[PDB]
Write a protein that binds this ligand. Structure first.
Ligand code: NA
Ligand code: NI
Length: 293
């Protein structure tokens, strides 16, 4: 099979064995990358969520021809516009994307998260998500979008500004069938990781989406599938794992890009579709949006 992980936090210190500035185990990032390559991951989109993190994502993406990155400001970080001067901050994000055309493939992560108002209030989130359509309009890059507990406001901004972006994906989607149908009507794609598959209602929503509008991702080291999640029973491929780090083993409770196969197994069993046929469609959809040239 072949995969493109549209949302992988490859810069996370967990992949270097680092926990709050402390070396807990040997840096195993290259081993993590190697396990993902072995299962068929061909490209990795390393997510950026503010100016500095987008620079960090780009700097890691420059280390390997399989790696790419995004530039944008996550809803939880949108206080950085007023802190730094909003027009300067926007221009810094714009320059970072425009000067790095090979590696930067999307504007984002951006959108809304009304379960995280303690990090950035609603008004600031709405204002600065909408402002980022200046980045998509100028760069002609597709968007990598976030929506939690905010469909109505998210749809309003996206629908009003649809002609200001070439396309995009609503990643780690966890909304209703009506929300998914409204997003597909705007010619947007729907991304699934483990966090999109936790409930029985999430599985039913997945069934309602045409396969030509789906993408796949892990959000590793987060969103690992747990037995309490509705789709866990469908996972078939396991990896050697240890609770205390050991060479050649995954670390218990740390998700990795290789675990994208488990997301594929869930999606294909839920939809009653051949696993490779669905994997190939997901790959082709991702190329069309993020790698068409
Ligand atoms: Na389960
Ligand atoms: Ni072993």
């Amino acid at each position: 099979m072949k995969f493109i992980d549209i949302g992988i936090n490859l810069t996370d210190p967990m992949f270097r064995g680092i926990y709050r500035g402390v070396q807990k185990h040997q840096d195993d990032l290259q081993d993590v990358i190697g396990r993902a390559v072995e299962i068929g991951v061909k490209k990795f989109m390393i997510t950026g969520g503010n100016l500095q993190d987008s620079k960090d994502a780009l700097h890691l993406a420059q280390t390997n021809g399989m790696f790419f990155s995004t530039v944008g400001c996550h809803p939880t970080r949108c206080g950085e516009f007023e802190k730094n001067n909003p027009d300067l901050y926007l221009k810094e994000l714009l320059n970072l994307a425009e000067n790095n055309k090979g590696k930067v493939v999307a504007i984002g992560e951006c959108g809304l998260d009304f379960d995280r108002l303690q990090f950035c209030p609603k008004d600031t989130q709405l204002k600065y998500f909408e402002k980022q359509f200046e980045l998509s309009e100028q760069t002609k890059l597709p968007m990598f979008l976030h929506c939690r507990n905010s469909h109505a406001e998210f749809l309003d901004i996206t629908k009003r500004n649809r002609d200001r972006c070439v396309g995009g994906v609503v990643h780690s989607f966890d909304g209703t069938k009506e929300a998914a149908a409204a997003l597909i009507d705007l010619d947007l794609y729907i991304g699934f990781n483990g966090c999109s598959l936790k409930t029985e209602a999430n599985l039913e929503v997945l069934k309602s989406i045409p396969s030509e509008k789906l993408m796949i991702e892990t959000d590793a080291p987060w969103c690992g599938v747990k037995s309490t999640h509705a789709g866990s029973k469908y996972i078939r491929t396991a990896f050697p794992t240890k609770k205390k780090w050991e060479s050649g083993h995954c670390l218990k409770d740390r998700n990795e890009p290789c675990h994208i196969i488990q997301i594929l197994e869930i999606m294909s069993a839920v939809r009653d579709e051949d696993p490779l046929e669905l994997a190939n469609t997901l790959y082709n959809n991702t190329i069309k949006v993020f790698f068409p040239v």
